[PDB]
């Protein structure tokens, strides 16, 4: 395909070229309709600066870079790739997963003094929410929350997920915002600022921690030392630091696609009206009429030591979708005599 | 057709040319009678600056730009296009949707200090109201409201929609009004001000959020730094910032057309007088005598976790329009024996 990759050089030409190649590959995969979950495993094998790349067992086979330019101080890379969009996979027949973006906090407010970027966590969780909402393939964002999610309180995680109707809750801590000064006699000072982050995803059905990853990137701080920067403004997010943080958010989305996309989606029972039950997933999540679903009885217990545990009882109950709304759906129980055993909170999975 | 597109250059000639092309295309579609809902999906494929554009499955097939001029500092584009106005579609046989423009707020009053444009949200919601009223094809505006609509209180949304007689409520938050300074030694300073906005549309029948989009544009701030600008005046709206905000409002209208226009319109039962019921839609909404309508029994519940849900019971009741007023209509129930089961709040849909 014909794609362009744009990335600014911070300290190494190799890193900027690799970032531009990643951007071009991401655009090519998005246009080709291929899954973006598989991209996050291709990057490690892209550390080398070889003109030709060979891969096996992937939707992309050979990568050939034809043009590399450093116009306006940032590397531009033009490549041609062959993408094979597979019609099958463990991610195409699943309903969309609702995700709640939790509180992202700055561990050390001391590091945010330069620029007074103290609301960077909130304005970055907003970016992560919008990235998951309008860029992901298998995720739906149900908003942000002001509460902090911890692994010590699975019950609170379950309650907050129930309140917001979220299958997973994602929250992080920003651990490094410090900067160093590089000085040259010919020119002015260069301030390279750090952005480290540790993201954690919790399963709202049982309170377990299902995802855990750490990110660290560096970018130039173009603003003055004594200048105050607003994190909601376009001045912050159009700068080199802002571009780096946007790339970090994209990597978060790609990692979530890589890890959670092929987990089987489990819509929950919202209400039971005799022989008809209601599902928390609807038309906007990919539900189509005539779908057959299998019911699981949910029983998740905190064990004797306070650690969350999971236990599902298999059921002989199968349901079919009768009416579909934008955000909910109605299902009819195919075994009327077993309809009395369905309670609120039981989960279902689509029969393939 | 023969159309002209006018757009001022802010930072890139490509953006100004694209905006002029969008303006010319919008005027051509409006004159041709084609639906304006389909325009909002054509813009993404217009990023390239190709002299010729090829499209499939659209009311416009080929676009050829013949004249491009930069007179008086703004790009003028003259094009010829072939538009095929389809007589069919999911948007031509539906009644008009009544929409209430909610409160639009400035999240950070700090950003509105320059020019003291603190009532920009209200005077922009007025523009959105007038744009939906006198420019849209499938919307009727029932005015503005001073209340804020949130996803946490579906009951309040339903009550406000009932009070104003609105099917949908649209409200937003203005998130960025900051500006940067570009300085040249030859000339004076250039102040480029930002305008970011997040619009949200709620369904008044059930309190659900049906639409969510974010807008961000930049334009020159021609006024002095210490000058106070009145947002109700023509000085504000005839400036470059005002033209940008008007274009943003037009994009809001086009996105609403793209998303909500083909939703089936559901007029509500206002009063029941024996065998005759009253409809909240009338002559001004497209109701014609002899129309056949199908009744749905409405039952929308808040579930155990406080989240809104929808549930409609299908009915064997069909109604026909007997007398038409400008704002209401009278319907006769075709099944007199079932007339006792019609209650206020039941919805109807036109039988096609």
């Amino acid at each position: 395909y014909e794609v362009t990759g744009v990335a600014t050089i911070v300290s190494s030409e190799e890193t900027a070229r690799l970032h531009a190649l990643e951007d071009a590959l991401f655009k090519a995969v998005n246009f080709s309709g291929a899954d973006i979950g598989s991209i996050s495993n291709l990057m490690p094998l892209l550390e080398e600066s070889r003109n030709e790349y060979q891969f096996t067992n992937h939707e992309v086979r050979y990568i050939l870079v034809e043009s590399e330019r450093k116009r306006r101080g940032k590397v531009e890379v033009k490549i041609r790739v062959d993408i094979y969009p597979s019609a099958t996979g463990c991610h195409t027949d699943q309903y969309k997963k609702t995700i709640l973006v939790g509180n992202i906090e700055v561990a050390s407010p001391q590091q945010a003094v330069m620029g007074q970027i103290y609301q960077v966590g909130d304005d970055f969780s907003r970016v992560v929410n919008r990235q998951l909402d309008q860029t992901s393939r298998s995720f739906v964002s149900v908003g942000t929350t002001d509460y902090s999610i911890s692994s010590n309180y699975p019950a609170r995680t379950q309650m907050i997920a129930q309140d917001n109707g979220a299958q997973y809750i994602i929250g992080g801590v920003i651990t490094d915002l410090t900067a160093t000064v590089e000085s040259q006699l010919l020119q002015d000072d260069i301030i390279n600022r750090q952005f480290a982050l540790e993201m954690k995803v919790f399963d709202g059905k049982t309170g377990h921690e299902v995802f855990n990853k750490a990110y660290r990137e560096v970018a130039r701080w173009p603003f003055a030392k004594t200048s105050q920067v607003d994190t909601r403004s376009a001045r912050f997010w159009a700068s080199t630091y802002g571009e780096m943080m946007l790339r970090v958010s994209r990597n978060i989305m790609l990692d979530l696609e890589s890890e959670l996309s092929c987990k089987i989606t489990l819509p929950e029972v919202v209400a039971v009206f005799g022989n008809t039950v209601t599902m928390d997933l609807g038309r906007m999540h990919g539900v189509k009429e005539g779908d057959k679903l299998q019911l699981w009885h949910t029983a998740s217990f905190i064990d004797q030591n306070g650690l969350p545990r999971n236990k599902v009882s298999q059921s002989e109950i199968t349901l079919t979708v009768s009416r579909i709304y934008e955000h909910e759906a109605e299902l009819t129980i195919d075994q009327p005599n077993l309809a009395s055993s369905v309670q609120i909170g039981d989960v279902m999975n689509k029969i393939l | 057709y023969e159309v002209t597109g006018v757009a001022t250059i802010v930072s890139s000639e490509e953006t100004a040319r694209l905006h002029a092309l969008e303006d010319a295309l919008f005027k051509a579609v409006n004159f041709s009678g084609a639906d304006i809902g389909s325009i909002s999906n054509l813009m993404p494929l217009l990023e390239e600056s190709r002299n010729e554009y090829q499209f499939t499955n659209h009311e416009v097939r080929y676009i050829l730009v013949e004249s491009e001029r930069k007179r008086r500092g703004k790009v003028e584009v003259k094009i010829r296009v072939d538009i095929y106005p389809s007589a069919t579609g999911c948007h031509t046989d539906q009644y008009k949707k009544t929409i209430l423009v909610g409160n639009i707020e400035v999240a950070s009053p700090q950003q509105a200090v320059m020019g003291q444009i603190y009532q920009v949200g209200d005077d922009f919601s007025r523009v959105v109201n007038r744009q939906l009223d006198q420019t849209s094809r499938s919307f009727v505006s029932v005015g503005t409201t001073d209340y804020s609509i949130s996803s946490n209180y579906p009951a309040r949304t339903q009550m406000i929609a009932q009070d104003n007689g609105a099917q949908y409520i649209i409200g937003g938050v203005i998130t960025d009004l900051t500006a940067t300074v570009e300085s040249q030694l030859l000339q004076d300073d250039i102040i480029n001000r930002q305008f970011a906005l997040e619009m949200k549309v709620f369904d008044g029948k059930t309190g659900h959020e049906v639409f969510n989009k974010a807008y961000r544009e930049v334009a020159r701030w021609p006024f002095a730094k210490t000058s106070q600008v009145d947002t109700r005046s023509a000085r504000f709206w005839a400036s470059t910032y005002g033209e940008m905000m008007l274009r943003v409002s037009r994009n809001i209208m086009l996105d609403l057309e793209s998303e909500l226009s083909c939703k089936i319109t559901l007029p509500e039962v206002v009063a029941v007088f024996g065998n005759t019921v009253t409809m909240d839609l009338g002559r001004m909404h497209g109701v014609k005598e002899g129309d056949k309508l199908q009744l749905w029994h409405t039952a929308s519940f808040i579930d155990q976790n406080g989240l809104p849900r929808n549930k409609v019971s299908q009915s064997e009741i069909t109604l026909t329009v007997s007398r038409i007023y400008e704002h209401e209509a009278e319907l006769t129930i075709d099944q007199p024996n079932l007339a006792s089961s019609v209650q206020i709040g039941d919805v109807m849909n036109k039988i096609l």
Binding site: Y1, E2 | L46, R216
Partner: peptide
């Protein structure tokens, strides 16, 4: 083929 380059809605800016 030839992938397009149309921009989309900004995530924050």
């Amino acid at each position: 083929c030839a992938m397009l380059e149309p921009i989309e809605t900004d995530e924050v800016t």
